[PDB]
Chain A
Amino acid sequence: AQVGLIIKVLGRTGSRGNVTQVRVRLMAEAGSPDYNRTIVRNVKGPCKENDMLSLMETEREARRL
Chain B
Amino acid sequence: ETMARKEWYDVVAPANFEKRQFAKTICNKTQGTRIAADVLRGRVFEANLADLNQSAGEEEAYRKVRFTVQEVQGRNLLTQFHSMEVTTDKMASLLRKWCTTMETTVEVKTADGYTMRLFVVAFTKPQANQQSRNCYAKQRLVKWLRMRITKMIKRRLSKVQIKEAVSLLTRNVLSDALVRRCNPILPLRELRIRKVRVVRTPKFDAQALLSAHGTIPASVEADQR
Chain A in direct contact with chain B (Cβ < 8 angstroms): no
Name B residues whose Cβ lies closer than 8 Å to a Cβ of A. none
